[PDB]
Design an enzyme around this catalytic site. Sequence first.
Site, PDB file in Angstrom:
ATOM      1  CG  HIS A  58      -1.955  -0.929   1.202  1.00 49.55           C
ATOM      2  ND1 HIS A  58      -3.093  -0.955   2.078  1.00 49.55           N
ATOM      3  CD2 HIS A  58      -2.363  -1.749   0.089  1.00 49.55           C
ATOM      4  CE1 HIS A  58      -3.797  -2.005   1.815  1.00 49.55           C
ATOM      5  NE2 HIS A  58      -3.477  -2.462   0.553  1.00 49.55           N
ATOM      6  CD  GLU A  87      -1.927   3.989   3.507  1.00 50.68           C
ATOM      7  OE1 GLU A  87      -1.471   3.315   2.526  1.00 50.68           O
ATOM      8  OE2 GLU A  87      -3.285   3.788   3.766  1.00 50.68           O
ATOM      9  CB  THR A 103     -21.867   5.909 -35.024  1.00 54.04           C
ATOM     10  OG1 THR A 103     -23.060   5.056 -35.171  1.00 54.04           O
ATOM     11  CG2 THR A 103     -21.856   6.978 -33.784  1.00 54.04           C
ATOM     12  CB  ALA A 104     -21.479   3.294 -39.263  1.00 53.43           C
ATOM     13  CG  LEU A 111     -13.266  -4.359 -27.582  1.00 49.38           C
ATOM     14  CD1 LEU A 111     -14.093  -4.322 -26.611  1.00 49.38           C
ATOM     15  CD2 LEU A 111     -13.138  -3.078 -28.295  1.00 49.38           C
ATOM     16  CB  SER A 168     -28.083 -12.134 -24.035  1.00 46.59           C
ATOM     17  OG  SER A 168     -27.620 -11.271 -23.559  1.00 46.59           O
ATOM     18  CD  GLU A 200     -14.289   1.430 -27.427  1.00 43.51           C
ATOM     19  OE1 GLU A 200     -14.767   1.693 -28.648  1.00 43.51           O
ATOM     20  OE2 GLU A 200     -13.403   1.836 -26.941  1.00 43.51           O
ATOM     21  N   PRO A 243     -25.632   1.134 -31.185  1.00 44.60           N
ATOM     22  CG  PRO A 243     -26.445   2.422 -33.102  1.00 44.60           C
ATOM     23  CD  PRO A 243     -25.528   1.392 -32.630  1.00 44.60           C
ATOM     24  CB  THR A 244     -28.930  -2.370 -30.002  1.00 43.63           C
ATOM     25  OG1 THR A 244     -29.488  -2.214 -31.443  1.00 43.63           O
ATOM     26  CG2 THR A 244     -29.782  -3.392 -29.103  1.00 43.63           C
TER      27      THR A 244
HETATM   28 CL   LIG Z   1      -9.706  -2.534 -31.279  1.00 40.36          CL
HETATM   29 ZN   LIG Z   2      -3.700   0.355   3.941  1.00 38.68          ZN
END
Ligand SMILES: [Cl-]
Ligand SMILES: [Zn+2]
Lengths: 364, 351
Positions: free
Chosen positions: B49, B51, B151-152, B194, B224, B289, B292-293
């Site tokens: 740390h 400190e 965008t695009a 990314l 999903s 990043e 739109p959806t």
């Molecule tokens: Cl990239």
């Molecule tokens: Zn500490």
Amino acid sequence: QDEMYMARALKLAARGRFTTHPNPNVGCVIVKDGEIVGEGFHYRAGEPHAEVHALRMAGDKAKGATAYVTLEPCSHHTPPCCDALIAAGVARVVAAMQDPNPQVAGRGLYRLQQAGIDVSHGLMMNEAEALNKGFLKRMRTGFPWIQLKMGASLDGRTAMASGESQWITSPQARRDVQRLRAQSHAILTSSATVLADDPALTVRWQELSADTQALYPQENLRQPLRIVIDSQNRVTPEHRIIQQQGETLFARTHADERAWPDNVRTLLVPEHNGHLDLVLLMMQLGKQQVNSIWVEAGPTLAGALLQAGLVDELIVYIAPKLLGSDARGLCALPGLEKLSQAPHFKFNEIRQVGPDVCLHLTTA
Amino acid sequence: QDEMYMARALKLAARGRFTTHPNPNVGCVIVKDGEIVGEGFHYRAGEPHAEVHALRMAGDKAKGATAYVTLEPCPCCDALIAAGVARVVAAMQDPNPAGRGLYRLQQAGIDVSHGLMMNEAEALNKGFLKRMRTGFPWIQLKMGASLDGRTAMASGESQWITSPQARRDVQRLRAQSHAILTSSATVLADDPALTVRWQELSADTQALYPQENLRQPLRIVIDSQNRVTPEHRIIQQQGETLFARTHADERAWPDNVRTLLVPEHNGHLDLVLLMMQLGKQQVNSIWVEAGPTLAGALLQAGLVDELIVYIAPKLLGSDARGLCALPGLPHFKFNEIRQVGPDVCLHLTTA
Ligand SMILES: [Cl-]
Ligand SMILES: [Zn+2]
Ligand SMILES: Nc1nc2c(ncn2[C@@H]2O[C@H](COP(=O)(O)OP(=O)(O)O)[C@@H](O)[C@H]2O)c(=O)[nH]1
Ligand SMILES: [Cl-]
Ligand SMILES: [Zn+2]
């Protein structure tokens, strides 16, 4: 050295920017032995010039005094300013810039040099040039200075899918548009917007910041010429824009056969394809001494002016809201299917206006 | 007077904003008889740390000295007492369940104080403080669009609307984010990596980040329906990848790939629960990043803490693809607007 007096002189010149059209903004500063003894600026057209105002205030103390003017003094007969300076016996004259006319420039300054006066030119020229972008452009080019205004949300939308364009920008933003309207020689709009919104497009002195109201006495309110682009005479004499204080000009392709108020007249512009030749319309306007045009247009006309290359300056107000992907866009650019053909610009100034930001762009 | 030292420890604290996660940023300055004999900041999670870093610097000179810390000391509290220090100055209290650290000094004879430049300290760990206070990460939504929010194009080009300067700026903002989130839709359209590209960091920022010290942000893909494949670029990269799945994929994935199972809600993945679970995994800040959806979905859920908008001086037209898809229909406020090359960057907070 001299920069204080000229800066003061241009600050004085800006005091006339609401009522000076079609004349430019000019300020005069008269100093004798390190003390200001004369100050003035041009306020309205046909009224006394800036140097005359200041000479009239300086009186006898102008002898051997230096004069700071934001432009070359009038050099032609009201009797010309350049000779009035000589009549008053000023020994030195400093001018920020010369006349914009390609031949008349330098004439006034020469006449003082011929009559024994100290003369110089160019000090704070860039600041002087910015004060009269419209007039200088019209004096050099045949065309006025064009301000395309756009007020959108963060995602570039100007109205929701319901059509409620009613006040998506800030009240401070509306005050800022009023100021820029007030110093504009003219306001231009399309009939598409007139039919959709039935707007007033008049400078409303009430919705002006008090700083400006302290420089713009209400009795001297100059209502800018309203120009409506109606290539198919769709606007009716019962729309709000024509029954307003001030004069309205209609850019028509052929004369409308209905009866209109006296404050409404028609300009006939030749046709291109199906509508007016927009560039020509700007040309005739320049020939009628219009310095600067403030454009309040929907997506269609904005796309046209850009696609014609008639825009000198983009003024974009952005509100800190997201208005959805199905809301109305900023401008309609027909045939723009790849982004290499997209229009390109340059950011000059970004500033905060209340909760909004205002972006100033130039073509290049 | 002592603000000059708090500001020093704040500047120190920011020196590790790139490598600190999941720990916060903390700086420490110990002054004794008007000289800073001790300095430190936390750099890497698991490393010492701040400190302690500062106490190791002050040594015997730490005795009878004064400690300025950007956050209440943790334990880091004991080494403070063990070093013989009076008058601890703390910028803010800990957002954990809190003042115990101040108590361990208040009742052990040490003077304490709280609040000095508290707002600036809170700004240095926006994610960590939110997570400790609500269990949710700090969510940054990045948008890069033309002058008309585009965008695009309708074709789907999008190829370099933003400047190369603005891309390098993004990499700077990426490199201090704990994690980077995107949607499968974006992964399928672009096959992106990314990754924080040290080669794409401006020399101003490279001064801070040493190349050999690079901490890749956790990569999060919301998939999903499990449409991303293990042939995609994003899984074949340095560091971890976390998949927000609804039901477990049955394929074999690299060792650095792991999945997070999120309950559905009305047939789609529940974004709110996703963030809530991500906080349990100790994720401080997320850099988003997204197309739109996804972007509208986060906004409509109320999950976006901050907008980063790059605007390029171009117009793409009113039929080109927009920024956020807002079904049914969001208010912000401009904090910082600044120039990045030929573009502008706008920083907006929820308002
Ligand atoms: Cl990239
Ligand atoms: Zn500490
Ligand atoms: N008569 C008329 N002209 C308009 C209106 N809005 C824009 N314009 C002008 O007329 C044209 C409208 O666009 P359009 O007729 O589709 O032609 P394009 O701009 O060349 O694609 C533009 O050149 C505009 O300058 C309107 O409401 N009425
Ligand atoms: Cl109006
Ligand atoms: Zn004159």
